[PDB]
Design a protein around this nucleic acid. Structure first.
Ligand SMILES: [Mg+2]
Ligand SMILES: [Mg+2]
Ligand SMILES: [Mg+2]
Ligand SMILES: [Mg+2]
Ligand SMILES: [Mg+2]
Ligand SMILES: [Mg+2]
Ligand SMILES: [Mg+2]
Ligand SMILES: [Mg+2]
Ligand SMILES: [Mg+2]
Ligand SMILES: [Mg+2]
Ligand SMILES: [Mg+2]
Ligand SMILES: [Mg+2]
Ligand SMILES: [Mg+2]
Ligand SMILES: [Mg+2]
Ligand SMILES: [Mg+2]
Ligand SMILES: [Mg+2]
Ligand SMILES: [Mg+2]
Ligand SMILES: [Mg+2]
Ligand SMILES: [Mg+2]
Ligand SMILES: [Mg+2]
Ligand SMILES: [Mg+2]
Ligand SMILES: [Mg+2]
Ligand SMILES: [Mg+2]
Ligand SMILES: [Mg+2]
Ligand SMILES: [Mg+2]
Ligand SMILES: [Mg+2]
Ligand SMILES: [Mg+2]
Ligand SMILES: [Mg+2]
Ligand SMILES: [Mg+2]
Ligand SMILES: [Mg+2]
Ligand SMILES: [Mg+2]
Ligand SMILES: [Mg+2]
Ligand SMILES: [Mg+2]
Ligand SMILES: [Mg+2]
Ligand SMILES: [Mg+2]
Ligand SMILES: [Mg+2]
Ligand SMILES: [Mg+2]
Ligand SMILES: [Zn+2]
Lengths: 156, 98, 113, 206, 112, 50, 46, 65
RNA sequence: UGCUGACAUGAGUAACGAAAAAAAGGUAUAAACCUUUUCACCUAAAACAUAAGGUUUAACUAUAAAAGUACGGCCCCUAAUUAAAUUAAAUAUAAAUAUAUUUAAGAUGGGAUAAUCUAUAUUAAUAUUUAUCUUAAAAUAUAUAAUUAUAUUAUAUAUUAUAUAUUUAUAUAAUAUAAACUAAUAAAGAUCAGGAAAAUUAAUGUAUACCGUAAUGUAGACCGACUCAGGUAUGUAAGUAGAGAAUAUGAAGGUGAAUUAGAUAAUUAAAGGGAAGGAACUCGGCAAAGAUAGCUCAUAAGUUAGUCAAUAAAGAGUAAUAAGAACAAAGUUGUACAACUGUUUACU
RNA sequence: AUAUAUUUAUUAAUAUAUUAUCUAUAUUAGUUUAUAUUUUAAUUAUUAUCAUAGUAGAU
């Protein structure tokens, strides 16, 4: 009667009309999921109609969509998956090197737009204020990497 | 070329100038003269041309009259081979050419 | 190679005026075209809904909960196992999903931090 | 065998009239990787179209990959006649050429620069190219209507992509025409069932 | 080709510091700049005064910065949406702190 | 930071080794920590184990 | 003919020859692994 | 200069701190050949087709009830 | 010529690794970073796409986006080969183990459908290597149906006009450059005789999983202890010229560098020119110099008959006569040894 | 073609300044070239770079 992609589109439309899932629900029923997702800020390359998440490394695209539907009530129409590389890191050169974690980030497309709330001022929020920790780090760098007559050299 | 100077090969115009029947040919697996150890047992054997071994009937069991359809070149033997066709049965087979 | 002796090649064989076909396309682009400055997409055209389900990952629509916005440690306690033991299955399931939601909100924030 | 498809050449109005695969319209495609835009007479495209547009590539404006996933439909613009759509398409190609080769310095001056004097980027995504394409589309359409029933329309991927309905898109000629700025229905996977959606749109205005 | 012995303290020092050729000389040929009453080299321009004049020229003969209209008239929210922030690399950060590795010119003493 | 370490448990053995430093090289470990910390942060009293 | 570049990496080959599972599968490799464990080795194989 | 603050030849690398390191460390998805497929425990979902495709088996797909 | 550590000496000496830089401004902080202009270098690359590799080096943490069609893996299939696996008694064996057979693994290879866009599931039933000539056909001109000379000759698409199903389909006719190149077709020459393995109709399905994707890749991002003139796989590689991927130039793109500025003694290296002479040099013409077409002609003695000798030497035509880019092209002979093309001491 | 001035009855004519000599479609898949169509898409003076200082003759 009709092609496969068209049938799929029709099914999706029907599910939307229903207010049921816009996708075939699986049979492997997870009652108590332990997976968390980190809603990320949007990059320049994305639109207001997209949202990107850090998800579990063993999280499926379909699984994510299901999670978004049932936990939150949001319906992701299209989903992409970006498994990042794990660059080598080490505490110091005396320690063994190992990779940082491969981290899975899934973009979604959604039928209504969204823009984040504006990040707070330094005076307003206590935590979101990068001056202090950065200063502390700088001071640590100065003190450990200070050698001889740079002990007398005044602090930055 | 000076390599051509002493190249003699006997001409057989009646000989077949086509491929052998593919059902009667098996691959001729190369060894380089190496046994199951992987060590050269037989010296001086190596990378020739690719070949197919031909399944030629030495036993000659079936019986009944068979017509020689063609006589071929065979790379794995000095003799020519003759493609027989059984007159009654229609079964095809190779045989050392007389 | 090119040399003193190389005579120039003949010109390519052109097809006569009468024999050449007229091209399928006659009228091309406008000559008046002008490079205008770009038109950057604006939020004014959007109507981001006040109850967009992605707000559920925030708490009171705050980019980050301050120390005052957070629940203090003395006021808050985790559930006791005995307390949980006399709760219904559906209730427990709901509690679990609320917990998970809270973690997600915190996880987003924690990551940012 | 048959080598050429509909996409394999430039198709004039007469060819379209003979065939009638799609209505009189032009398709526009964002590049999710780099932010570059790709115009086409058809809902599909090939390497030939890419070659035609991306003629002078550099580090800033690299010749894009033909991988199908990173290409996504920015805008589907419908017009009153096949000939008109062809003319619009030609105008867009001309504008692109001007920006890349002929009047490149002027275009560069017009763009947004970052510190260290480069055209603003995030990764290899440059958001100026899309903006230029919208501005170029607006220009080409305007020229077409100056040169010059169905009310023409521009089906957008996204309503946000307009600069502003007051500042731009409110010329007298457009208003006279009845240029309806519609958007494509997102009741399904927009990226995956894109071709189906485009077909449905094509069917709608015929 | 090769030293036959450990060269002594005496012999390395008389080699290095004994000859006047190898020593540093006093810069006797300083004199007053007429524009600002400070030390400068003889038969040389004052680096302060010429620098000041160069600065003046820059301030006057200044090619105007190109601010595109469309970016100048963006809303703040809209601008944030379009052009979000980013983490700079370690190298980039190092490059940014120019005062760490870039030497500004010192002023000379006032002549008497 | 720009870390991503906090979303995982990578290089676990190395972390254990660092975390569970031998107690006889505890002065060595804390000497550099003391140096790093400013005067208003640092405390004189010994940071006892859990 | 300049020497020195005798190592010519190719992950697949390395894993075939010196990978953990190759060691495990052979008796000799299993013995090696055991020996490394006894020594105290952090990294038993590629 | 690779970096303008370092005019002279310190023993600093073109990138990173040390070239050398422990080579014997488990592979990731990014490493290896074109044929090297690690996977991330994400998709024991359906079944691989004879032709190279894939067919989801929905009774073996995770819902979050 | 003890071991470890620390610090001297040579010495502020050599060296800073094939290199084209200049100004203005960012910035009254720049030989070295960024921008603009000028200049140069690479250009069948120092470009653009990729493979492998690797401390992610990237245009970066707000990070490399795939149901599939000039998208790869995964998957199906197997090659080379591998396997504490497989078969009262498979066979052999001081143990280890080894052999044969099964099964399983194993890419460097094979794998349906597709812009008209395409649908992969389940159930049921019975292809070494090379070549495209000659003839023949019709076409275009000269001469008087047939001769002479010249190209053309299997496929690839839009247009227009017809005839049949009914503006969508099928077939026919006519219109339309040259030179390379591709794929697919056909016919076929040579001996060295050219992989393996995995069905079709009908009904019922199909909500399309995972992993790769940055940049670098004749290299500062791999292998060489170094940001090492070494080693490193594949495809495009603007035109003008040409037999050509030779050679010159260089449209575009990329680049001009962890050393600079001056001075340029002796001396060294790598180049350019040289009166009169022309091997007198030297173990030795080593080194350097030496090309009067590269196309078309023509080309000897000897000889194993192979234009082997030959790309013969000389020589001719075209071009040039005072000369006036690069690159290809560098004599003739006698003797000793070895038939010849090959192979050899990676580094004398 | 644009910008700035002058005349004329925004237009045309003149003067000065700046920029431009591209582009697109046909000839049966691709590339180049050629011609045709399309477009305002120019041919003389004088320079420079590169090819061993490009080569050569003088100096
Ligand atoms: Mg992916
Ligand atoms: Mg023998
Ligand atoms: Mg798709
Ligand atoms: Mg080594
Ligand atoms: Mg090592
Ligand atoms: Mg790799
Ligand atoms: Mg796939
Ligand atoms: Mg002693
Ligand atoms: Mg000395
Ligand atoms: Mg000296
Ligand atoms: Mg020196
Ligand atoms: Mg400056
Ligand atoms: Mg060459
Ligand atoms: Mg198998
Ligand atoms: Mg393969
Ligand atoms: Mg890559
Ligand atoms: Mg890329
Ligand atoms: Mg590249
Ligand atoms: Mg190198
Ligand atoms: Mg290395
Ligand atoms: Mg070395
Ligand atoms: Mg060329
Ligand atoms: Mg150039
Ligand atoms: Mg490069
Ligand atoms: Mg250098
Ligand atoms: Mg002389
Ligand atoms: Mg002379
Ligand atoms: Mg002598
Ligand atoms: Mg002599
Ligand atoms: Mg010589
Ligand atoms: Mg003779
Ligand atoms: Mg030569
Ligand atoms: Mg010999
Ligand atoms: Mg040797
Ligand atoms: Mg063609
Ligand atoms: Mg013109
Ligand atoms: Mg050059
Ligand atoms: Zn002064």
């Amino acid at each position: 009667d009709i092609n496969v992609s068209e049938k799929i589109y029709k099914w999706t439309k029907a599910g939307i009309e229903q207010g049921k899932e816009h996708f075939k629900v699986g049979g492997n029923k997870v009652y108590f999921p332990k997976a968390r997702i980190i809603l990320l800020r949007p990059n320049a390359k994305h639109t207001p109609y997209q949202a990107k998440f850090i998800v579990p490394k063993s999280f499926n695209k379909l699984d994510l969509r299901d999670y978004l539907y049932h936990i939150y009530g949001l319906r992701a129409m299209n989903i992409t998956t970006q498994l990042l590389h794990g660059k080598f890191n080490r505490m110091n050169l005396q320690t063994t090197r190992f990779r940082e974690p491969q981290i899975k980030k899934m973009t979604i497309e959604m039928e209504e737009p969204f823009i984040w709330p504006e990040e707070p001022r330094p005076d307003e929020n206590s935590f979101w204020d990068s001056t202090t920790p950065d200063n502390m780090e700088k001071y640590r760098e100065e003190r450990l990497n200070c050698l001889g007559s740079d002990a007398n050299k005044p602090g930055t | 070329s000076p390599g051509l100077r002493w190249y003699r090969s006997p001409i057989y115009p009646y000989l077949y100038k086509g491929r052998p029947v593919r059902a009667l040919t098996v691959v001729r697996k190369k060894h380089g003269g190496r046994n199951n150890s992987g060590k050269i047992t037989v010296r001086h054997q190596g990378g020739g041309h690719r070949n197919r071994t031909r399944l030629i009937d030495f036993n000659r069991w079936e019986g009944g009259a068979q017509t020689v359809q063609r006589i071929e070149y065979d790379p794995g033997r000095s003799s020519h081979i003759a493609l027989l066709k059984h007159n009654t049965t229609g079964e095809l087979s190779y045989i050392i050419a007389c | 190679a090119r040399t003193k002796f190389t005579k120039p090649k003949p010109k390519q064989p052109v097809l006569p005026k009468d024999k050449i076909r007229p091209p399928t396309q006659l009228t091309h682009h406008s000559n008046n075209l002008r490079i205008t400055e770009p038109i950057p997409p604006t939020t004014s055209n959007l109507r981001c809904p006040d109850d967009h389900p992605l707000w559920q990952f925030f708490s009171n629509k705050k980019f980050i909960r301050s120390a005052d916005d957070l629940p203090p440690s003395s006021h808050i306690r985790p559930w006791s196992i005995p307390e949980l033991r006399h709760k219904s299955f559906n209730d427990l399931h709901s509690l679990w999903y609320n917990c998970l939601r809270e973690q997600n909100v915190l996880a987003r924030e924690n990551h940012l931090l | 065998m048959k080598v050429n498809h509909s996409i394999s050449r430039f198709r004039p109005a007469s060819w379209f009239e003979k065939t009638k695969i799609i209505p009189p319209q032009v398709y526009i495609f964002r590049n999710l990787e780099y932010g570059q835009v790709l115009y086409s007479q058809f809902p599909n495209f090939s390497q030939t179209q890419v070659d035609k547009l991306f003629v002078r590539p550099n580090w800033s404006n690299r010749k894009p990959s033909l991988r199908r996933d990173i290409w996504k439909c920015m805008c589907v613009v419908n017009l009153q006649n096949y000939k008109q759509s062809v003319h619009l398409y030609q105008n867009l190609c001309r504008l692109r050429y001007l920006r890349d080769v002929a009047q490149r310095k002027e275009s560069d001056k017009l763009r947004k620069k970052d510190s260290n004097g480069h055209v603003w980027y995030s990764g290899q995504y440059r958001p100026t190219y899309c903006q230029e394409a919208v501005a170029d589309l607006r220009e080409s359409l305007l020229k077409v209507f100056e040169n010059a029933a169905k009310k023409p329309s521009i089906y957008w991927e996204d309503p946000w992509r307009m600069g502003d309905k007051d500042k731009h898109w409110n010329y007298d000629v457009f208003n006279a025409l009845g240029l309806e700025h519609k958007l494509i229905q997102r009741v399904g996977n927009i990226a995956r069932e894109e071709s189906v959606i485009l077909k449905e749109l094509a069917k709608l205005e015929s | 080709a090769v030293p036959k012995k450990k060269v002594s303290h005496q012999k390395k020092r008389q080699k290095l510091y004994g000859p006047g050729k190898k020593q540093l000389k006093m810069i006797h040929h300083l004199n007053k700049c007429p524009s600002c009453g400070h030390y400068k080299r003889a038969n040389t321009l004052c680096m302060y005064c010429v620098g000041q004049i160069s600065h003046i020229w820059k301030t006057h003969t200044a090619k105007e910065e190109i601010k595109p209209r469309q970016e100048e008239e963006l809303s703040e929210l809209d601008q944030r949406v379009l052009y979000p922030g980013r983490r700079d690399t370690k190298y980039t950060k190092d490059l940014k702190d120019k005062d760490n590795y870039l030497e500004r010119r010192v002023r000379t003493l006032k002549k008497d | 930071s720009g870390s991503y370490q906090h979303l995982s448990n990578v290089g676990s053995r190395v972390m254990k080794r660092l975390g569970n430093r031998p107690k006889n090289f505890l002065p060595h470990s804390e000497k550099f920590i003391k140096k790093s910390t400013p005067e208003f942060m640092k405390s004189d009293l010994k940071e006892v184990d859990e | 003919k300049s020497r020195g570049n005798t190592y010519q990496p190719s992950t697949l080959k390395r894993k075939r020859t010196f990978g953990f599972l190759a060691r495990a599968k052979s008796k000799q490799g299993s013995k090696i692994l055991k020996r490394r464990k006894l020594k105290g080795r952090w990294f038993l194989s590629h | 200069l690779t970096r303008p603050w370092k005019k002279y030849r310190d023993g600093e690398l073109f990138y990173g701190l040390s070239k050398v390191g422990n080579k014997r460390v488990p592979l990731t998805t990014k490493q290896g050949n074109k044929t090297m497929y690690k996977g991330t425990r994400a998709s024991g979902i359906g079944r691989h087709t004879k032709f190279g495709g894939y067919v989801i088996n929905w009774k073996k797909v995770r819902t979050y009830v």
